[PDB]
Amino acid sequence: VKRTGPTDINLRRLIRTLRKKSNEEGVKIWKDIAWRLERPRRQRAEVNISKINRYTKEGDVVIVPGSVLGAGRLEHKVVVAAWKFSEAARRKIIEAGGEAISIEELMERNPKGSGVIIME
Amino acid sequence: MIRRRKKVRKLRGSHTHGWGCKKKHRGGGSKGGRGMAGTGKRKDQKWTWTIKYAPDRLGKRGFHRPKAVQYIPKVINLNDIDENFELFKDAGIIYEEDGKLVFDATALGVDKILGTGKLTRALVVKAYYVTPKAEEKIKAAGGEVLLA
Amino acid sequence: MKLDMKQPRKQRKFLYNAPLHLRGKIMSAPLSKELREKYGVRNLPIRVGDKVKVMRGDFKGVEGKVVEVDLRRYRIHVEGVTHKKTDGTEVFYPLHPSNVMIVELNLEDEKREKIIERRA
Amino acid sequence: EDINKKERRLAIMSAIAATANYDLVRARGHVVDNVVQIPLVVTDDLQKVFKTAQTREIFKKLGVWDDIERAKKNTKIRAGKGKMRGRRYKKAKGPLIVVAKNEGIVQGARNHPGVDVVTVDNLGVEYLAPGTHPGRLTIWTKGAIERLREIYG
RNA sequence: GUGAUCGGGUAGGCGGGCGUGCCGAUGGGGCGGAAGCCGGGCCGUGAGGUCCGGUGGACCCGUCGGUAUUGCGGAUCCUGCC
RNA sequence: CUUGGAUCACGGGGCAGGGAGUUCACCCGAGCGGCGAGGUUAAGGGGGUCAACCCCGAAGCCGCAGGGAAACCGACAGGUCCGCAGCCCGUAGGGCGAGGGACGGGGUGUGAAAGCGCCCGGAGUCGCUCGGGUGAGACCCGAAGCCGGUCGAUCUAGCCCGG
RNA sequence: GCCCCGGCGAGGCGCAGGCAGCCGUCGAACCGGGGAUGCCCGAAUGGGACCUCCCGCGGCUUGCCGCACUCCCAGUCGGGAGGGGGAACGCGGGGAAUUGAAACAUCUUAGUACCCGCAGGAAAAGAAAGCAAAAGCGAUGCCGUUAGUAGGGGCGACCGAAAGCGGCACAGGGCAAACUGAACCCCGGGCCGAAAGGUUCGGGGGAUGUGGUGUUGUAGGGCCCGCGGAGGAGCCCUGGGGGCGAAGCCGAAGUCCGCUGGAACGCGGCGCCGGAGAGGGUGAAAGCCCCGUAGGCGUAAGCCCCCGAGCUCCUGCGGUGUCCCUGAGUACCGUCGGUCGGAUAUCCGGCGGGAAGCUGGGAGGCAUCGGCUCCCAACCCUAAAUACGUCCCGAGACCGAUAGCGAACUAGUACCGUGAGGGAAAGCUGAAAAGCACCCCGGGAGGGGGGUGAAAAGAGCCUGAAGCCAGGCGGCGAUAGGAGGGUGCG
């Protein structure tokens, strides 16, 4: 069947912005994140705080191309960027001394994407 | 949302509508029988389907006990006891009397505490039954269990 | 009369098969200002013996007098308002009282006077 | 067709934020060259107006009279068999008045063509987006905005 | 930009478009002549659209989104006419 | 239709109008969207500018623990490796490496037991649309016949009464 | 089509546009309410039907009443009931086959189609000899779930619940017996009373029991004892007020100036109302010409509520017992047939056996023993929430005259069949008939001229397509060979 795309004008704008930002800076992580956001909806990523804490480390920077959910416990501090968040995830990340931000703000605070980790 | 078109609208002008020759979409012979006919008991049209996909559909295995006799217990794990530590403390289940901390066996009203999961804190648990692994992990965390 | 129906077919059916004690009302006509500032009434049901001014049609301007009312067809006749046949004989031209203005009232009946002192 | 509460409410909120924007309102078809603010907030004295003349004058001083006139002029006789079934006079849309508590403004403004009056505890998506086109010209009151500060939806 | 290594097609599967009736919106036309019918010009691979002249005498179209008793050359098809 | 139609194979005098994959209930999947270890309300109740609109209502169903005919018993929020994307060092290559693959450990049934089977390291649910399967007349037309209850001996067969 | 009471307020005499005439202002037609008359057949009924027509018997003065069958109360007279009809919904009985299982026989189709009987505006059910399980609920009935589950089945195809939980709606009363013993009911006539009701006379029944008391569960009631003596909740309308309630009534604002046009409801300009910009009509597209609309008034008889109104029919609380009472071919057991999810454990019926009966008896998913828990059958009544729509109001992403109901129309009509039964087609002049005066030809239907009209739209009537036919124009045309076409040049 014909795989259309996302129906959210804001997702589409973000995808275009990412591809153009990768062209500007001269990198790949943004184009990669673009094709992961453009992937069918019955397949989009869902990551949990157990996983973030397992494979993260104090001070790390993380980008999830999808949804972050609250199931587990975060012991240390992290900066997580995501499209959607849950109330519990915001709560738990803010506690522990962390940031729960967006990919727009990530591209502002870091254009080259140095040190960022993909978790899909 | 995505509202797509029905395909009879495109098959208008097809002369068969996707069914093949002009003789294939007639009746029950076309299906091999109405229903699950030909399943291997008395006839064998679809005996092949049966032995590939639906074995254990023909026969009898076991007995059932009556519902007036069945009682199903409630079970909680240490994972839950740890990840729900603030609600049970805020309301009811936990009684902080005379030291340590105390966990009571009546959140939902439960019988068995199973051992899946680590535990961080040290408590004193009172419930009808508790499992060996759970006992070990509690003891290690530095708590004690007293059966009722 | 109570006519509370947003269905054109019910409206039209009422108008066609209306009883005869309600057709006179539907046959109402307006009054002149010179009679409004005297009686304090804007319209009345039409009656033979009344004087009329035609405010619409080919006989626009003609002043006349009512000599015949027909309820079954919702029409009236006015002396002075006629056409000729191919023979040469004259016949009345039927009018609707929406296109007609009363300029002199026939009041020799107590019931018309009661109508007036009802709606003034 | 079933719909979930949360999606419904998210859509209602998006429609509110849309009507608060100047370019969407101008694109939907409304006359806004005289309107003063967009969004138009006004005192709670508008709840007790019960005469169409007074509301006419108030709308003239705000700047929505011309949208009411557009509504009246773009009312037209429809094409089809609907005229048999009634349902002629395809009518155009004018502005909304959103109100905390009605004290006469319904009687007052209900006849003007295209206008609608509604409370905040009864707000839906069709008052704000007719035809699935957001950006309806909307007049809020202080009471309504302070009730939204609570509801949020 | 690349295609010496793309350009036939029954059963069948997939993609995009033309046309018909009703609704919610938006923008327009009409007794200085609407729909329909006849003969012609232009665009269009095409399904089809639009204009000119005539006849006719009151309603009709476009874009966005929804809905459907939604498209005929055949059934020793049905009805009516020749 | 047929391996095979200009066929001495079937349908075919002309025009206009009508004329054939629908609806429900369950199941398998997808294209989107909402919430998310939880998701979702039904009957119904209250309010309103009264068939549109708004608020309440989680009873129940699915999910979070599985094995076993049953009694009954009751698990890895990461121990090792290989490694795609992407990141770091650089100038080819080398390092960490989510998701993915392979080991190891555990629960239970079976067995003296070892070993084997299912299962365990947190993603589901609620909706709109579409494709399909099963059942209902189930894309449209066509039987001979089977069953039930009423009508008929002005035809024709037989019998009686009177000619 | 006749009469009376009210409303409306001038014309009227059905679909149905004619000639001639009558009715009405002493209030019509029309609308609402109430009365009269009301042929024959038909349940059809005094007795009979080869033709919806005939034949009679008593009693009173041509006119009248009465006289079916089966039953109750009476009984020599009389008084009463039933019978037939009704779309769908309702209670009770009888009961197939096609079909599916890719054949078929048990199963399925199906307790279905159809048949027989009985009721109503709703019917049916309904007040635990129940549900359940260490806790408890508290009559029936309906919705949503429980659940395609428990469970049935050539264990195949397939069939298929309940309790509970969440809600709608809520309501409980009476007999039989024990103990008393005519203290009682009905009909007809008479006197009080406005009436609801009370008091006398004569008859019918009732000792084979009319009336009173009494009604249930770790028991209840009676008899005995003591003490106490709130049946007073309801019936009626001579009364005094209220609300609801017919036909109906009131209801704002432009017919302003120019142009087109046969006609403004149009195009330009200038104004007005609005608790009314819903809908329709009027010579074209109308908030302001008319009906109406938003919003207010008004109503008979009848139904109800507050009060005042006079008027009824038996009795509570507690003790104490070697007193009495508490529903029989019934509970139950075996067997046969049917039916159910009901399985060794559903319900109905026939046959053969058959109890105890308050120191009693039943249920608890095979039988039996013990324990514990729950209840008292074999007699009766009962609203509300529910189902339907031969009907009404009101609406519509429904059809728009080969569609939509079979019927937009003198349609279940014409017509067909001995009959049971079957079953069509058929809408539209124009704003106004102004529906073609008159002349010539024709036996005539008619043709030709003239006239009406904004336009013949001419009743054989809005628009008026194709196939078909005639004529006029253009091209080819009597030495000529292919499915009626394609490519190129003339």
CA distance readout (Å), D109 to C42, D70, D129: 28, 16, 20
User: Which of A48, A45, A44, A46 lies closest to A89, judged by CA?
Assistant: A48
Rg over CA atoms, chain C: 16
- How was this model experimentally determined? cryo-EM
User: Which of A52, A73, A59 lies closest to A115, judged by CA?
Assistant: A59
At residue C101, the 3 state secondary structure works out as: strand
| CA B32 – CA B57 distance, rounded (Å) | 19
* Rounded (to 5) percent helix, strand, coil in chain D: 50, 10, 40
Does residue D117 lie within 7 Å of nucleic acid chain F, judged by its CB? yes
For residue B17, give how far its alpha carbon lies from the nearest alpha carbon of chain A (Å): 19
**Who's near D12: CB < 8 A, 6+ residues apart?**
D123, D124, D125, D128, D153
Give, as ranges, the nucleotides of chain E with any atom within 7 Å of a protein CB. Answer: 11-17, 21-30, 59-61, 64-67, 70-71
Q: Which residues of chain C are within 8 Å of residue D86 when distances are taken between CB atoms?
A: 6-8
**Who's near C3: CB < 8 A, 6+ residues apart?**
C11, C14
Sheet strand arrangement including B124-126? B102-104, B124-126, B144-145
C6 near D CB under 8 A: yes
Place of tokens 């004087």: C51
Residues close to nucleic acid strand E (C-beta < 7 A): A 1-2; B 3, 6-7, 9-10, 12, 14-21; D 28-29, 70, 74, 76-83, 85, 87, 90-93, 126, 130-133
Q: After which residues is chain C broken (C to N over 2.5 A)?
A: none
User: Which of B44, B39, B143, B139 lies closest to B85, judged by CA?
Assistant: B143
Residues of A with CB under 8 A from a CB of B: 4, 7, 73
The DSSP bridge pattern shows strands B144-145 and B124-126 to be parallel
Q: Where are the alpha helices (DSSP H) in D1-141?
A: 5-19, 22-28, 52-62, 65-73, 105-109, 125-128
| CA B35 – CA B140 distance, rounded (Å) | 61
- Amino acid present at B91: A
Q: Within 13 Å of residue A113, how many CA atoms lie on the same side as its CB?
A: 22
How many Å does it take to go from CA B46 to C1' G298? Answer: 83
Give, as ranges, the nucleotides of chain F with any atom within 7 Å of a protein CB. Answer: 1-2, 21-22, 30-38, 40-41, 47-49, 52-55, 65, 69-71, 73-78, 85-88, 97-99, 120, 122-123, 126-132, 134-136, 138-142
Place of tokens 């004193």: B124
In this structure, the dihedral spanned by the alpha carbons of residues A7, A11, A17 and A22, taken in order and rounded to 10 degrees, is -110
Give me the helix-helix angle, A29-37 and A9-25, nearest 10°: 160
